[PDB]
């Protein structure tokens, strides 16, 4: 499935989550194949250039939806600013719904273009991995698993721990709760129903974003504990070729799922607060309308 995110005002983007994980997974296989033997550590910059060329091409196909994405941004600007144009919420909700439908439609159209780029990364990554060999097949070195972890994964585990993700969720629940509490009070006094309808809508969007952040936070917490336990087992020892390779695929799988949930949680956090900024404005404007009224 595809997620549509809003980092800052006027900045909509999209992620095809399975593609993100697929592409990341095959980046881990690639580095693990070249780090297994010391005679291939120099090839790191070639793997880098290849992976960046694949994402450049992936992003170029995303750029085909630029005009439909920009359409949705403008419609979202009308939705997020009912105080500037001031009538018929249903028409505005239907407008957003179809412009959003049109974006997913554009995305689905380029499915084969996206799959060819993904499948090129898979073929590239499996090519290096299928030629990974040991001096003694009964005793394959785990220094590549170690180096890759220290230089590619340990930086993200420390970074994610320094952030208190569980307090980010506490903060968001206070926001959601005080917003409903005020919302329910203002609804009993009326004013511009357009403002209450857009507050109700943005608020529900925020609960849905919160659920996704909460879900991705659980995964980040579980995967950071799983990568740290599992890394200990796959390091400081040797393995038979078969077991070393099954363990390279298992680590790559854990890393890609963690990196995915970290990427999405961060983006959904930017989206929650970007939407919250607009809820605040509409609350400010409804209170102005209500107070400067007749009795």
């Amino acid at each position, epitope marked *: 499935s595809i997620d549509i995110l809003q980092e800052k005002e006027g900045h909509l983007d999209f992620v095809i989550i399975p593609h993100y994980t697929f592409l990341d997974y095959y980046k881990h296989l690639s580095y693990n194949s070249i780090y297994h033997k010391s005679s291939t550590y120099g090839k790191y910059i070639a793997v880098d*250039a290849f992976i960046k060329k694949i994402n450049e091409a992936y992003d*170029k196909v995303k750029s085909k939806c630029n005009d439909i994405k920009n359409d949705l941004i403008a419609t979202i600007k009308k939705l997020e600013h009912p105080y500037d144009m001031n009538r018929t919420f249903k028409k505005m909700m239907d407008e957003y719904n179809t412009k959003k439908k049109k974006l997913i439609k554009c995305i689905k159209n380029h499915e084969n273009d996206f799959n060819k780029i993904c499948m090129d990364m898979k073929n590239y990554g499996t090519n290096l991995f299928e030629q990974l060999s040991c001096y003694n097949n009964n005793f394959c070195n785990t220094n590549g698993i170690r180096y890759h972890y220290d230089e590619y994964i340990h930086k993200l585990i420390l970074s994610v721990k320094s952030k208190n993700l569980n307090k980010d969720l506490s903060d968001m629940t206070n926001i959601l709760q005080q917003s409903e509490l005020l919302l329910t009070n203002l609804n009993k006094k009326m004013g511009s129903y357009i403002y209450i309808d857009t507050i109700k809508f943005i608020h529900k969007e925020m609960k849905h974003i919160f659920n996704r952040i909460e879900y991705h936070t659980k995964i980040i917490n579980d995967k950071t504990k799983i990568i740290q336990d599992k890394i200990k087992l796959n390091i400081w020892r040797t393995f038979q070729k078969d077991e070393l390779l099954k363990r390279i695929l298992d680590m790559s799988n854990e890393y890609s799922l963690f990196i995915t949930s970290d990427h999405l949680r961060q983006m959904l956090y930017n989206t929650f607060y970007s939407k919250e900024k607009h809820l605040n404005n509409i609350f400010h404007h409804l209170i102005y309308v209500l107070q400067m009224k007749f009795n």
Partner: antibody
Amino acid sequence: QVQLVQSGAEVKKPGASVRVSCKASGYTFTSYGISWVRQAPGQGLEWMGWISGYDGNTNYAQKLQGRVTMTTDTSTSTAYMELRSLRSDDTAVYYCARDGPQVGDFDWQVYYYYGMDVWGQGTTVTVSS
Amino acid sequence: IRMTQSPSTLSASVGDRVTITCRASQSINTWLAWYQQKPGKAPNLLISKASSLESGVPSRFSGSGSGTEFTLTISSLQPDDFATYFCQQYNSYLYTFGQGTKVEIRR
């Protein structure tokens, strides 16, 4: 926006040197390399050299050995092409193109199999008395 | 080290199936790239590991071949495909281009 912008047209007298620049944008310069290819008026394409943005390793064509010197500046993401002892047959549109970072290195095509995928607009260089 | 294109000029109509042939002097495995050059403009990469279609290049462009024999194919010649094409070896660190193959409009 991935691009390469080159310096303007140049008129040089025989026996002189030319200095064509090639500024990169939209990509990590130090993760790739720059190849230089020219085209004499009404003729085909001729490869002159390659340089790595990662380590400054160069590979020149034998025809231009001891005459061409390509350098790089990681700070500004610019690639230079310096051709000295200019001759009449050096009149050409000189182009710069994005290439892999380790073309010298053996089995390089296995880690980056792409061709020269991004080109500069070209630089008209005229050699004449 | 020496690429030879055949033919060097080709007369074709819109909608036609066209196939340029590129031959090498010695084996270059599958390390061949294809380029398109519109007059007064810069070449564009078309194909990479003799068959890898570069992202965003019309699917009408296809490549094939290994060792010495290579072919570029345009399934449905469109108004933009009329230009000169270059094949290029990158098996050795010293690149070598073909002489070019002009595709002009028949009338």
